[PDB]
Amino acid sequence: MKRLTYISKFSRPLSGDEIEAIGRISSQKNQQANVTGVLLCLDGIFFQILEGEAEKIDRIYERILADERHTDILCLKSEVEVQERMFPDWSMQTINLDENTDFLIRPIKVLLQTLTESHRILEKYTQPSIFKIISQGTNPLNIRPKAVEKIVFFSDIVSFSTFAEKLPVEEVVSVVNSYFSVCTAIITRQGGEVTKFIGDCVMAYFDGDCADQAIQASLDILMELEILRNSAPEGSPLRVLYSGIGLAKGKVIEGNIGSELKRDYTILGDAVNVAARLEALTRQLSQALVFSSEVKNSATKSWNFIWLTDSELKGKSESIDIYSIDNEMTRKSSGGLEIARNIGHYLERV
Amino acid sequence: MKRLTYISKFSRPLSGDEIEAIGRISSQKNQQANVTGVLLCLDGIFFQILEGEAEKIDRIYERILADERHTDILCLKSEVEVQERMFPDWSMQTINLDENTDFLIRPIKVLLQTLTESHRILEKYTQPSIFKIISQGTNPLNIRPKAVEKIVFFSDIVSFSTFAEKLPVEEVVSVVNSYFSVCTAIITRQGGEVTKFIGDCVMAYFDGDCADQAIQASLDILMELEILRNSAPEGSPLRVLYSGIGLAKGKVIEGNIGSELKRDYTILGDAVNVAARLEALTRQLSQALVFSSEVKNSATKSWNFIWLTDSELKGKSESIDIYSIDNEMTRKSSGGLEIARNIGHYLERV
Ligand SMILES: Cc1cc2nc3c(=O)[nH]c(=O)nc-3n(C[C@H](O)[C@H](O)[C@H](O)COP(=O)(O)O)c2cc1C
Ligand SMILES: Cc1cc2nc3c(=O)[nH]c(=O)nc-3n(C[C@H](O)[C@H](O)[C@H](O)COP(=O)(O)O)c2cc1C
Ligand SMILES: Nc1ncnc2c1ncn2[C@@H]1O[C@H](COP(=O)(O)OP(=O)(O)OP(=O)(O)O)[C@@H](O)[C@H]1O
Ligand SMILES: Nc1ncnc2c1ncn2[C@@H]1O[C@H](COP(=O)(O)OP(=O)(O)OP(=O)(O)O)[C@@H](O)[C@H]1O
Ligand SMILES: [Mg+2]
Ligand SMILES: [Mg+2]
Ligand SMILES: [Mg+2]
Ligand SMILES: [Mg+2]
């Protein structure tokens, strides 16, 4: 048996009668599927527990995810190998706590609402990967550190300091947040983890055998930024949003790193400095994407690699062969330094 | 009227009779103080709401904070200017939810326990400054970005890469976490905010008129690390834990920066790169603390300033006069580079 617990937000005001109707239809369908559970609502939040055979639960959950009446759905707990039902008599019991005025329920209602409001704010400041660990029954704070091979991804906005000097503060934050949204969506789609934002820079990582996905994510980010620049409104600062990207591979420490007050689940190791140094090299090259030979040698697809004769690294141990991809993007550029001049002239005049 | 809502963890197993006795004594004292509220417990967690005149609530709360029977106390909500009691008939009503088996309470119990467990994990990955904003009734996600003057603090471990190469992974993480705990405790004590960990580096900030506190925090960190090095056990890697510190002042953007998936409440601006560049300069100087003339000129105490003739910055706009403090610490050092050699020889032999 499987049991799922999730919370969600009303997409729109729902009357008491609409909530009842959801419970009625839910009861009718769940009974046929030998599914049981409970549905609670409180001040625009749904809480639901569903239990039954895993095959049936998975299908019902997918349907519920498509329901336009709620949004921001977060699974808090996914129990598998369950051997005893919690709510055996309830195909779907619906409890509208807004309408309840029992005396002993009152203080529990207040606490649940206060905790939920706080939880839903903290979710926005937490990486989603933490939630999947929690939902599976593991406390991420107890994960022991391990050494593991990763592909490290660094991307950094070109000449961001210019934006900050020429634009109102709200517009500056809008540009950087737009950049982070573009990169996060594509990295996550390719199976990477965005682990930290460092000013105008994205730090992410992929599994050590996922060089092909790291390369593809990088190429797709560069293409998305070109579309964004070309399709932005007249006078928009997004027209001069450019990035570099550097990739490196190596053994890093993955674990909980920080103080008693605040920790991060993240990585530590030399491959991080190598990726950051390679990203910085793009300011001196025509190419916006650079990566080390270890990344090139770990790829399995027949990428259009180009070997670059600009291995002037610093801080390394024995230098590094540098590669890029030769396509329409990394080829037709004004290079770096020329781009930085272009950004200042454009922003001076808007 | 004031109303406080907090959660805490049992410091030790408490029997049902001990919880009742807490409620009895609480009832007797609260009645005299015209305080009302409710006390709930569930699987080793306390939840309490207290309401009454602010003067009385503050005193009672301080006493409760000293009670050895609970720990990890977090105030979730602090309401001031309250005009109506929630629980007027209850000096302190005690509800042991572990012992309750009402039927309708059952699903609420499960949700509350699931949400609380998740909340308490997320607290460890969140900066405490976020919680104080929430508890005051403000949603930090809705704070608009603003330009503000700050003192930016950077500190970075000397030759950390050596630790990572020579020690088992668990010991490496122990060293960096010990360093972060030392810095966080002192920065917070002096009114600073630790905003990000970047590998082996602490990024923090102070209000723009708090140069004296930023300097004092830096000096106290250097003194604490010397005590730690001298008092560590034979063979401990903490014996060769050294740091640099750089401070700079300038106008930065403070606000929510990130993606729809994850954001940070943090700062952005040129003063950050200046502080990071100054910290890096300590590797070439005998001094472990460097700061810009804007920090020196904003201090109000008669510090023992020394003007350093090593202003060879890069990436700035018009260079920078560099200062330190001339005391026993910044004076008697082997300088940088010499320290890096010392660390490798020591760790090679343990
Ligand atoms: C919070 C919420 C919870 C729901 N829970 C269930 C459920 O447990 N079982 C179910 O069949 N439908 C549930 N639904 C409804 C489905 O999303 C969908 O409307 C319904 O299954 C379609 O039924 P129909 O195709 O027979 O019209 C829920 C909807 C919402 C907004
Ligand atoms: C969760 C918890 C909640 C408490 N709540 C109250 C309260 O509301 N009012 C109160 O006077 N003491 C409360 N106490 C007890 C105080 O910490 C302290 O033991 C008590 O006030 C001392 O009483 P006495 O000095 O008369 O012996 C609480 C203790 C715990 C562990
Ligand atoms: N060493 C650093 N550590 C942390 N954050 C930094 C560091 N250097 C810069 N930043 C952050 O990044 C922002 C942009 O600085 P950055 O060096 O990327 O300049 P830029 O104008 O974007 O130029 P470039 O094209 O070289 O990236 C700074 O405002 C600061 O917020
Ligand atoms: N540019 C960077 N951005 C983010 N994290 C970095 C960067 N460079 C290094 N790190 C992180 O910091 C860790 C330590 O690198 P660092 O440059 O501090 O070397 P070090 O051996 O401690 O020497 P130093 O005395 O110069 O600080 C690296 O393992 C990586 O986790
Ligand atoms: Mg940049
Ligand atoms: Mg940057
Ligand atoms: Mg270091
Ligand atoms: Mg570092």
TrEMBL record, chains A, B:
Residues of the BLUF domain: 1-93
Q: What coarse category fits the chief subcellular location reported for this protein?
A: other
Q: Where does Ca(2+) 2 bind?
A: D310, D321
Segments forming domain Guanylate cyclase: 151-279
Q: Where does Mg(2+) bind?
A: D156, I157, D200
Q: Which residues bind FMN 1?
A: K29, N30, Q48, R63, D67
Output this protein's name: Family 3 adenylate cyclase
Please state which protein family the record places this protein in.
Belongs to the adenylyl cyclase class-3 family.
- The UniProt record gives the binding positions of FMN 3 as N30, Q48, D67, R69
Where it sits in the cell: the answer is: Cell projection, Cilium, Flagellum
Chain sites annotated for binding FAD: K29, N30, Q48, R63, D67
- SMART domains found in the cross-reference section: BLUF, CYCc
Q: Report the superkingdom from the record.
A: Bacteria
Residues spanning the signal sequence:
none
| Keyword list, A-Z | ATP-binding, Calcium, Cell projection, Cilium, FAD, Flagellum, Flavoprotein, FMN, Metal-binding, Nucleotide-binding, Repeat
